[PDB]
Amino acid sequence: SSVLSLVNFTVDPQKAYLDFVNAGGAPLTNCVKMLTPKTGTGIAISVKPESTADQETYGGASVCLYCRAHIEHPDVSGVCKYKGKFVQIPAQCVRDPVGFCLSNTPCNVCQYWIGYGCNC
Amino acid sequence: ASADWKPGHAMPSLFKVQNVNLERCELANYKQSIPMPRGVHMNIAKYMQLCQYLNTCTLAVPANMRVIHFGAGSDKGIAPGTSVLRQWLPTDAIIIDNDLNEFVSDADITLFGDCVTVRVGQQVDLVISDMYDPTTKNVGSNESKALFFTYLCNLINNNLALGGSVAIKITEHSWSVELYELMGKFAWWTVFCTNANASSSEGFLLGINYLGTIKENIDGGAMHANYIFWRNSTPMNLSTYSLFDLSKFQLKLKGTPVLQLKESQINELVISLLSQGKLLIRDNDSVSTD
Numbered sequence: 001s002s003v004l005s006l007v008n009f010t011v012d013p014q015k016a017y018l019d020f021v022n023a024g025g026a027p028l029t030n031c032v033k034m035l036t037p038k039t040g041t042g043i044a045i046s047v048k049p050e051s052t053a054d055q056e057t058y059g060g061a062s063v064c065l066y067c068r069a070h071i072e073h074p075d076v077s078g079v080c081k082y083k084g085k086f087v088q089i090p091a092q093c094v095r096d097p098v099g100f101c102l103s104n105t106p107c108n109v110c111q112y113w114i115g116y117g118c119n120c
Numbered sequence: 121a122s123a124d125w126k127p128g129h130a131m132p133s134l135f136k137v138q139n140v141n142l143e144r145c146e147l148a149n150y151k152q153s154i155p156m157p158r159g160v161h162m163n164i165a166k167y168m169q170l171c172q173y174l175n176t177c178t179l180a181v182p183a184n185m186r187v188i189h190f191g192a193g194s195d196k197g198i199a200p201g202t203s204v205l206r207q208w209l210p211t212d213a214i215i216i217d218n219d220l221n222e223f224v225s226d227a228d229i230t231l232f233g234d235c236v237t238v239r240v241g242q243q244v245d246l247v248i249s250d251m252y253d254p255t256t257k258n259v260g261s262n263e264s265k266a267l268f269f270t271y272l273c274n275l276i277n278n279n280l281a282l283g284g285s286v287a288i289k290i291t292e293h294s295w296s297v298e299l300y301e302l303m304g305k306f307a308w309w310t311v312f313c314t315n316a317n318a319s320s321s322e323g324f325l326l327g328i329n330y331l332g333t334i335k336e337n338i339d340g341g342a343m344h345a346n347y348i349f350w351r352n353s354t355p356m357n358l359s360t361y362s363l364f365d366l367s368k369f370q371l372k373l374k375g376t377p378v379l380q381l382k383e384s385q386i387n388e389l390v391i392s393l394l395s396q397g398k399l400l401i402r403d404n405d406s407v408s409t410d
């Protein structure tokens with residue numbers, strides 16, 4: 001709730017969140033972690049949970065900074081890339097799913113996280 | 121302890137046929153909690169177990185299935201139950217959710233405000249309610265409640281497809297005579313208590329396959345008394361063991377057909393199909409805030 005109100009006093013919410021947690025600020029809590037058979041494909045964003053054994057799946061709206069802070073999405077299409085879908089996060093980054101998402105991008109050809117699945 | 125591996129307990133006909141006064145509910149394990157599988161909200165487990173029990177019921181599951189989820193928000197501003205519904209339902213299901221307070225969710229349409237402001241223009245296929253009014257904690261005698269139940273009863277009577285189903289949260293003190301009576305208009309009904317929240321008088325009142333006519337004449341005040349008698353008589357252990365194997369969690373893609381029929385045309389065959397979860401009757405053509 002501190003960091004949520006902070007990202008409303010700035011023109012660059014992504015940087016404001018990332019600077020906050022990189023400086024020791026508490027990550028946003030209450031991301032909606034799902035229970036899943038860890039038997040999925042491992043892609044970044046999916047219509048159903050796809051965590052592998054090395055990932056956790058979250059409800060997409062809950063790990064979207066723009067959804068959580070009720071601020072305008074940066075997508076020119078106006079449509080959130082996560083809301084209504086599921087987001088896979090490496091299991092070693094579950095301390096800050098929102099920060100992981102702000103910090104990383106799915107590969108444009110294979111849809112796995114660049115650096116965390118994308119073999120291209 | 122086979123029951124600990126089931127998703128929860130369903131009220132048996134042994135208790136539905138009783139005739140007793142309404143008593144105070146006294147659970148031996150009251151308010152105990154179980155830790156959750158991970159950094160995982162308790163409502164994840166509760167909703168998953170409700171879904172697991174609904175997997176054993178004859179739900180109609182059409183294409184473009186119409187699902188409305190009332191009481192979906194939380195004091196954390198998120199909606200764990202809605203995300204479970206998204207994980208469970210077909211990918212082409214439409215989820216509309218609603219709460220008095222602002223939240224964000226994975227529904228297709230999210231409406232804020234009293235459920236009475238939710239205008240259901242077309243009939244729906246599945247209603248989930250987790251609504252509960254804080255004032256219900258200020259307990260004289262335990263009488264039937266109005267609250268949001270007046271709205272839900274009217275919804276069942278007007279805005280629910282034939283063959284559609286409902287799961288409506290109740291508790292010892294949060295309950296409605298009229299809603300119990302309306303369970304007699306479904307092909308089958310029960311109260312289902314999750315193992316994840318077995319230490320609470322919470323149950324989900326389940327109406328499976330709406331027929332629009334009275335199949336069972338239920339005395340609703342007496343039936344709540346029977347529900348409390350059942351809970352007072354039935355050891356239930358807190359458990360989430362049913363969630364260890366999720367390979368078959370997702371709702372079966374039944375492809376249930378949707379037909380439009382006039383009431384004069386609804387005959388024995390159609391009633392049989394509706395009662396077996398094999399048919400919905402409604403338009404096949406709008407949920408907004410009024």
Ligand SMILES: C[n+]1cn([C@@H]2O[C@H](COP(=O)(O)OP(=O)(O)OP(=O)(O)OC[C@H]3O[C@@H](n4cnc5c(N)ncnc54)[C@H](O)[C@@H]3O)[C@@H](O)[C@H]2O)c2nc(N)[nH]c(=O)c21
Binds near residue numbers: 150
């Ligand atoms: C079943 N029960 C009820 N009471 C007494 O009766 C009162 C009201 O009884 P209730 O109908 O609220 O039932 P219960 O206490 O079992 O409900 P619980 O709090 O578990 O709530 C169940 C679900 O309701 C929703 N809910 C409860 N409170 C709120 C709220 N304040 N706001 C939003 N949702 C809420 C939540 O989803 C919650 O999980 C209780 O607050 C308590 O004094 C009991 N007392 C003892 N000693 N042993 C009992 O077994 C017992």
Ligand SMILES: C[S@@+](CC[C@H](N)C(=O)[O-])C[C@H]1O[C@@H](n2cnc3c(N)ncnc32)[C@H](O)[C@@H]1O
Binds near residue numbers: 163194199
């Ligand atoms: C137990 S909470 C919901 C928890 C949520 N289902 C979850 O997935 O965590 C009960 C919800 O009922 C909502 N509610 C109570 N009365 C309502 C009403 N009349 N109309 C809409 N929502 C109502 C409350 O605001 C509260 O968020």
Ligand SMILES: [Zn+2]
Binds near residue numbers: 065073080081083
């Ligand atoms: Zn978003």
Ligand SMILES: [Zn+2]
Binds near residue numbers: 109110
């Ligand atoms: Zn790639």
